[PDB]
C-alpha cells in the first residue's frame, strides 16, 4: 500500500475539523419551512422566534436536522441504487471483472479519496458499499428525538452524508459502465433524439420511468433478439432514458431508444395517450400513474421492490396469463420482479395492447375546449395552488375570446403536476387545456442530446491545464440537477449558451442535459452539435445520469492529483482545500427539488466546489454564505512559512439561490475567481465577470477592485479607463508613464504563494 492520508473511512468525528473550518468562513443560513416540529408525540412543538421544543432543540437545530434528513435520504437512494445494480452485475457477469472506465491513472477518485482503497475488480467494490451502508445507518440514528442538539454538528453530519452520497454514486456508475458496455471516456458519444415529438404513434410505444436500467436492459435485449426495433418505439423518462441510450454504445453507433423528457413531462405524456405500456422502476416516478392509466387503458408494470405501487404480485405466474388478465381489464398492472419474464412481458404486452387502445387520450377536442374554457368563473384558486405561480385565470379569460396564446406560453412554464385541477370547483382539466393549446409546439418538440461520455480522461485534463493556466479557459461550469425550473426549461439553455460563447468548460448531466438539448438556433442546430463534446474550452460534454455527477466532482479531485502530485488516498481535507483555493469550478442546479440534488450539492461543498441553486431550492432550509464585509473572515495560512495570508473574497458562497438566469450567470462568472490565479487567468475571469455584469445588471460591479492586485489583472480592452477609475475613485497610485500600478492594492501579487486553510500543512 502507498501513502495513506490522515482520514481514511471517515466518521462524524473524523471530518469535524475540516467542516468547522469551512463553516467558520461560509456560515450556514437557515430558512425554515415551518415554525413547528412534528417528529415525536411530545409535539408538535412551536419554535417560532428560535424557541426550543419539549426536547430542548431550537428552530435552528430543527432546520439543520431537516436538511440533514434530506441529505441522508438522497445518499440512501444512490447507495441503494448502487448496491442493487452492483449485486445484479456481480450475479450476471461475475465478481472478478476488471474495472473498465477509460484511460486514467486514478480510476475511482471519490472512492480513493474517501476510503483510501484502490479497487481493481467488481468484487472490490463490495466492501466500499458495506462501509457506505454502515456509516449511513449511524447517520439515520441521529434523526431520532434526543440525539444531536447543536445545529452545527447537524451541518457536519450533512457534509459527511454528502461525501458518502458521492462515493455511492461513483460505485454505481463504475459498476454499470464496466458491465453494460457504456462509452468509456468517449469525446464523440452518439447523439440521441429527445422530445415529445420524437415518438411515433403508428407503432406500439413503451415508456420506461425511473432510474434503474437492470430490467430495461432485458427488455431491449428481447426487442433486439426478436427483431422488433423497427416495429416498436421505446422511450424513457428521467435518467433511465440516459441509461438506455448509453447501453452498448461504446461502438459509437446511434441507438434506437428515445428520451421523452424529464419528470415534468410524465403526466403530460400519460395525458397524450401515446404510451401503450408504462414500466416503472424506482426513483422519480409520479404516484398517480395508475389513476390515469386506468382511464386511458395504459397498463403499468412495476419492476422493483422499492416501488410496487400496491399492485398484484404476478412474479410466479405465466406471461400469457398476465397478458390475458391485463387485456381483459381485470388488473391495471402488476409487479414483475423476475427480469427475464419482464423483458418478454413488456414488449408482448405493448404489441397486444396497442390495437385495442389506439385513439384514446385526455386531450379535449375543439368543442370540448370551448365548453371547458367558457365554464370558468375566474375564482383564482388554480393560481393559488400553482407551484410555479402561473397566471391561469388570465390565460383562461384570454382564451375565452379565442386568444389561446396565453396557454401556449404557460405550457413551457408548467411542470405538469395537476395540482390546479384539484382546487377547481368547476372541474376543469387545466393541464389538458394547456396541452391542447400547445399541441403544435408539442408536435414540433424535437432535439438532439449527446449520450453520456462517462468520466473525464487524464489526457483531456492535462491538455486543459495549460489552457487554464495561460488564461484561455476562464473556468469550469457544471449544469446539473432536476427540472423544477421557475421560468421554464429554457434558462439552462440560455446559461449554457452564454457560457459556451465565452469559452468556458460546460459539463451537463441529468434532466438539465435533456432540457438544454431541446432548443435550436436559426440553423436548426442544438448546442450539442454546435459545440464539440470534449473536455476543453468552448465544449459541452454530457456525463449521463445523476450517478455520473461524481465524475464531475471526481474530475476536480484529479486536478489536485495529476498536477500538484497530491496524495488522494484518505486525504479529504487536503484535496478539498486545494480545490477551494485553486480550481475555478462552479456547479448549478437550476431546478433542484429532490433529496438527491441536496446530497449532491452538499457533497460538492465538502469538496470545495461552490454551487448555485434555483429559487425553489430556498425551501431546502440551508445555505452556506460568507460575510464579505468581515475582513477577518478572509485570512488563510502560507504553506511556505506558516505566515498569515490575505485572499480576495472569492468564492463568496458555497450554496446560495439565485432568482433569475441573468443573476445566475453573473454569480457563476464571479465565483470562478480563485486566490491562486496567475495574471492571465485573473484577467480573463475579471473580463468575463465585468462584461456579464454590464450586460445583465447594467452596472459595473461595486467590488471589482478587490480582485485587482496587478496592472496585468485588468481586461485588455478596458485597461486604461479601469486604471483611471482606480486612481480617481480610490486614490490608488498608478505609474501613468508605464501603465503600472505603483501602490494601492491590499493584497500583493505572488504566484509562488501557497494559500491553505489547514495549519498542519505549513512548514
Amino acid at each position: 500500500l502507498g501513502p495513506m492520508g490522515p482520514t481514511p473511512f471517515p466518521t462524524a468525528a473524523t471530518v469535524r475539523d475540516w467542516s468547522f473550518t469551512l463553516f467558520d468562513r461560509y456560515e450556514p443560513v437557515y430558512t425554515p419551512m415551518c415554525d413547528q416540529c412534528c417528529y415525536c408525540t411530545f409535539g408538535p412543538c412551536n419554535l417560532e422566534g428560535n424557541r426550543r421544543g419539549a426536547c430542548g432543540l431550537d428552530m435552528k437545530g430543527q432546520a439543520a436536522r431537516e436538511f440533514f434528513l434530506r441529505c441522508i435520504t438522497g445518499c440512501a437512494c444512490h447507495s441503494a441504487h448502487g448496491r442493487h445494480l452492483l449485486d445484479h452485475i456481480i450475479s450476471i457477469f461475475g465478481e472478478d471483472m476488471p474495472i473498465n472506465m477509460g484511460a486514467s491513472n486514478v480510476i475511482a477518485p471519490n472512492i480513493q479519496l474517501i476510503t483510501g482503497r484502490q479497487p481493481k475488480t467488481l468484487g472490490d467494490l463490495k466492501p466500499i458499499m458495506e462501509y457506505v451502508e454502515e456509516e449511513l445507518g449511524q447517520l439515520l440514528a441521529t434523526v431520532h428525538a434526543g440525539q444531536e442538539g447543536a445545529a452545527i454538528d447537524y451541518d457536519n453530519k450533512a457534509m459527511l452524508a454528502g461525501i458518502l452520497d458521492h462515493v455511492g454514486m461513483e460505485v454505481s456508475d463504475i459498476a454499470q459502465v464496466t458491465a453494460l458496455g457504456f462509452p468509456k471516456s468517449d469525446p464523440e458519444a452518439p447523439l440521441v433524439e429527445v422530445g415529445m415529438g420524437t415518438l411515433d404513434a403508428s407503432k406500439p410505444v413503451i415508456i420506461a420511468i425511473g432510474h434503474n436500467v437492470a430490467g430495461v436492459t432485458y427488455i431491449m435485449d428481447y426487442m433486439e433478439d426478436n427483431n422488433l426495433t423497427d416495429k416498436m418505439e421505446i422511450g424513457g423518462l428521467c435518467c433511465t432514458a440516459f441509461d438506455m441510450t448509453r447501453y452498448k454504445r461504446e461502438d459509437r453507433k446511434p441507438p434506437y431508444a428515445k428520451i421523452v423528457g424529464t419528470i415534468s413531462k410524465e403526466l403530460k405524456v400519460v395525458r397524450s395517450g401515446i404510451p401503450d405500456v408504462i414500466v416503472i422502476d424506482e426513483q422519480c416516478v409520479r404516484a398517480d400513474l395508475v389513476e390515469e392509466g386506468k382511464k386511458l387503458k395504459i397498463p403499468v408494470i412495476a419492476s422493483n421492490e422499492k416501488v410496487m405501487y400496491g399492485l398484484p404480485d404476478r412474479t410466479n405466474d405465466d406471461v400469457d396469463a398476465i397478458i390475458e388478465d391485463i387485456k381483459t381489464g381485470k388488473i391495471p398492472g402488476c409487479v414483475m420482479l423476475d427480469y427475464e419474464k419482464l423483458g418478454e412481458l413488456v414488449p408482448r404486452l405493448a404489441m397486444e395492447m396497442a390495437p385495442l387502445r389506439e385513439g384514446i387520450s385526455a386531450i379535449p377536442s375543439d368543442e370540448e375546449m370551448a365548453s371547458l374554457v367558457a365554464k370558468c368563473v375566474a375564482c383564482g384558486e388554480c393560481a393559488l395552488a400553482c407551484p410555479e405561480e402561473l397566471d391561469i385565470p388570465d390565460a383562461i379569460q384570454a382564451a375565452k375570446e379565442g386568444d389561446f396564446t396565453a396557454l401556449d406560453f404557460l405550457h413551457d412554464l408548467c411542470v405538469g403536476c395537476r395540482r390546479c385541477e384539484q382546487v377547481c370547483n368547476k372541474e376543469i382539466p387545466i393541464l389538458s387545456v394547456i396541452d391542447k393549446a400547445a399541441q403544435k409546439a408539442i408536435a414540433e418538440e424535437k432535439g438532439l442530446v449527446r449520450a453520456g461520455r462517462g468520466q473525464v480522461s487524464d489526457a483531456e485534463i492535462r491538455a486543459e491545464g495549460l489552457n487554464l493556466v495561460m488564461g484561455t479557459t476562464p473556468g469550469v461550469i457544471a449544469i446539473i440537477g432536476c427540472a423544477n425550473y421557475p421560468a421554464g426549461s429554457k434558462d439552462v439553455y440560455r446559461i449554457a449558451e452564454e457560457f459556451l460563447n465565452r469559452n468556458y468548460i460546460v459539463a451537463v448531466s441529468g434532466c438539465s442535459a435533456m432540457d438544454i438539448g431541446m432548443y435550436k438556433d436559426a440553423d436548426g442546430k442544438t448546442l450539442y452539435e454546435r459545440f464539440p463534446g470534449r473536455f476543453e474550452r468552448g465544449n459541452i460534454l454530457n456525463t449521463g445520469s445523476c450517478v455520473s455527477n461524481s465524475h464531475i466532482s471526481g474530475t476536480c479531485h484529479k486536478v489536485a492529483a495529476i498536477f500538484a502530485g497530491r496524495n488522494l488516498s484518505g486525504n479529504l481535507a487536503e484535496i478539498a482545500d486545494y480545490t477551494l483555493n485553486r480550481v475555478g469550478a462552479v456547479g448549478l442546479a437550476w431546478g433542484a427539488y429532490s433529496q438527491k440534488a441536496a446530497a449532491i450539492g452538499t457533497g460538492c461543498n465538502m469538496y470545495g466546489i461552490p454551487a448555485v441553486l434555483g429559487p425553489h431550492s430556498g425551501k431546502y432550509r440551508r445555505a452556506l454564505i460568507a460575510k464579505t464585509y468581515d475582513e477577518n473572515k478572509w485570512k488563510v495560512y502560507d504553506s511556505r512559512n506558516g505566515s498569515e495570508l490575505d485572499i480576495p473574497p472569492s468564492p463568496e458562497f458555497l450554496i446560495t439561490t439565485a432568482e433569475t438566469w441573468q443573476e445566475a450567470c453573473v454569480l457563476l462568472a464571479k465565483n470562478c475567481i480563485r486566490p491562486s490565479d496567475n495574471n492571465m487567468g485573473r484577467s480573463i475571469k475579471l473580463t468575463h465577470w465585468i462584461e456579464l455584469s454590464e450586460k445583465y445588471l447594467g452596472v459595473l460591479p461595486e467590488d471589482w477592485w478587490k480582485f485587482v492586485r496587478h496592472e496585468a489583472d485588468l481586461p485588455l480592452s478596458r485597461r486604461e479607463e479601469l486604471l483611471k477609475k482606480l486612481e480617481t475613485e480610490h486614490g490608488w497610485e498608478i505609474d501613468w508613464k508605464k501603465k503600472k500600478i505603483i501602490s494601492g492594492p491590499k493584497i500583493k501579487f505572488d504566484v509562488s504563494s501557497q494559500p491553505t486553510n489547514l495549519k498542519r500543512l505549513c512548514k
Binding site: D458, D677, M680
Partner: protein, 393 residues
C-alpha cells in the same frame, strides 16, 4: 469604436452567408507581417491603405490582403518580431465581425456585413489592433500599419516576407546555449503546481510547447518581476549535462527546497521538473536499457504495457523524480537532446504517428533503428528487434 472588442468573439465564425469580403484567404494572396524599425522611422497612430479601401469593395468578392506592422521603441529588437506576430491572430479575433485564421502567409480574413456597415474604413480596426498590442506589450511605444490591397503590392511584399521568414528560421535554428547570456525562467504553472519551476533555453524548449527562449525574453521584458523572469547562467558546472550554477540557485530559491539542482539534457541525473502539461513523456526500459517516448495524443499501449495516462501519472507535481521526463515536441529538434545519456543513441521506441511527426529529428541511419508499435507488440519482441538491427544500445 464602431464594433465591440472582447475575447468572447474569438469563437465566432463568419460564414459566407454573412460574409461581405474575404480578404486574402486560402485562394488569393494573403500575408501578415511585423517589422522592427528605429524610433525615427515610425509615426504613431498611422493607418496607410494602398489600393482599394473598404468602400471600394464588392460583397462576396475576395481581394488580396497584406498587413505589415512597423513596431518600435527602446527594448523592441528584431528577434522579438515573431512573438508580436503570434498575437496578431488573437487580437484580430477580439473584434466582433472580424474572423482571422492561420498565420504567416496562409492567412485567412473575413468581415461580416453587420460590422462592415459599422466600420466604414480600415482605420478604426487598425487603431483597435494597435491599442491592444500596446496594452498587451507596454514596451512597444510606437506602432503603425500598412494595409496592402492590390495584387501588385501584395506580390511586391511577398518576396521580402519570404526572405525575412527564411532569415528568422535560420536565426532561431542557429541559436544555442553558449551564444546566450540569460536563461528565461517561467513559473506560470505555479498556480496549480506550487513547486514547479521551468527553465527555457534555445536548446531546451518549454515542456508545454508554448514558450520559446524568445517568448520568455519578451515576457520578461514586459514584466521583469512577474512569473516570467531572466536569470544569468553563471558558472558552467557541467557542459555534458547542461548544469549551470545560476539555474541551481534559482531552483533552490523558487522550489522551497523540493530540489536544489536542475540538470538540463539529462534523464537519470537531476532531471528537469514538469507540472502536468507534457506534450511528450519519456520512460525507461531497463531490460533493454532504452528510452521510450509517448505523446499525449497516443491512444495505445507501450512495450512496457502502459498507456500515456498511467505513465504520466508517475511524473509531475514539481517533484524531481527519476525514471520519466516530460518534454515538448520541439525538444526532439534540439542538438542537445538528452545529450548526457547518449542523445538519440538511447531511444528504442516511439509510436508510429510520433515518428512520422518528428522524422526530421531522427538521424537517417537511426531512422530505421528506432522501433515503433507497427512491428513490436511486447518486450521480448523489442529485445529481438534491437538484437536484429544492432541498436547502439
Amino acid at each position: 469604436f464602431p464594433f465591440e472588442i472582447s475575447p468572447m468573439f474569438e469563437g465566432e465564425r463568419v460564414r459566407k452567408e454573412g460574409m461581405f469580403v474575404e480578404l486574402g484567404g486560402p485562394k488569393s494572396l494573403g500575408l501578415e507581417l511585423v517589422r522592427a524599425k528605429p524610433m525615427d522611422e515610425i509615426e504613431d497612430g498611422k493607418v496607410t491603405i494602398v489600393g482599394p479601401d473598404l468602400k471600394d469593395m464588392e460583397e462576396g468578392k475576395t481581394y488580396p490582403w497584406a498587413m505589415i506592422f512597423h513596431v518600435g521603441g527602446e527594448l523592441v529588437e528584431p528577434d522579438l518580431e515573431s512573438v508580436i506576430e503570434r498575437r496578431v491572430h488573437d487580437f484580430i479575433n477580439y473584434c466582433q465581425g472580424i474572423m482571422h485564421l492561420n498565420q504567416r502567409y496562409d492567412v485567412w480574413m473575413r468581415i461580416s456585413k453587420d460590422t462592415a456597415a459599422k466600420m466604414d474604413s480600415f482605420e478604426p480596426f487598425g487603431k483597435a489592433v494597435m491599442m491592444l498590442f500596446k496594452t498587451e506589450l507596454p514596451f512597444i511605444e510606437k506602432m503603425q500599419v500598412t494595409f496592402y490591397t492590390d495584387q501588385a503590392e501584395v506580390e511586391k511584399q511577398m518576396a521580402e516576407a519570404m526572405e525575412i521568414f527564411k532569415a528568422r528560421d535560420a536565426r532561431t535554428k542557429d541559436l544555442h546555449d553558449e551564444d546566450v547570456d540569460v536563461f528565461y525562467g517561467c513559473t506560470l504553472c505555479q498556480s496549480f503546481a506550487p513547486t514547479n519551476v521551468c527553465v527555457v533555453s534555445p536548446d531546451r524548449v518549454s515542456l508545454c510547447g508554448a514558450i520559446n527562449w524568445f517568448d520568455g525574453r519578451a515576457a520578461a521584458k514586459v514584466d521583469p518581476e512577474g512569473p516570467q523572469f531572466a536569470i544569468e547562467k553563471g558558472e558552467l558546472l557541467d557542459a555534458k549535462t547542461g548544469e549551470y550554477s545560476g539555474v541551481n540557485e534559482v531552483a533552490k530559491k523558487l522550489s522551497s527546497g523540493e530540489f536544489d539542482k536542475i540538470k538540463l539534457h539529462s534523464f537519470f541525473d537531476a532531471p528537469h521538473t514538469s507540472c502536468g502539461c507534457f506534450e511528450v513523456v519519456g520512460f525507461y526500459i531497463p531490460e533493454v536499457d532504452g528510452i521510450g517516448w509517448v505523446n499525449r495524443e497516443y491512444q495505445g499501449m507501450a512495450p512496457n504495457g502502459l498507456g500515456f495516462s498511467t505513465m504520466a501519472g508517475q511524473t509531475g507535481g514539481g517533484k524531481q523524480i527519476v525514471g520519466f521526463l516530460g518534454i515538448g515536441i520541439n525538444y526532439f529538434y534540439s542538438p542537445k537532446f538528452i545529450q548526457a545519456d547518449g542523445g538519440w543513441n538511447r531511444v528504442v521506441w516511439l509510436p508510429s504517428m510520433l515518428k512520422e511527426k518528428i522524422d526530421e529529428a531522427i538521424p537517417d541511419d537511426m531512422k530505421d533503428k528506432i522501433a515503433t508499435e507497427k512491428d513490436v507488440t511486447d518486450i521480448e519482441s523489442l529485445k529481438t528487434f534491437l538484437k536484429e538491427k544492432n541498436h547502439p544500445v
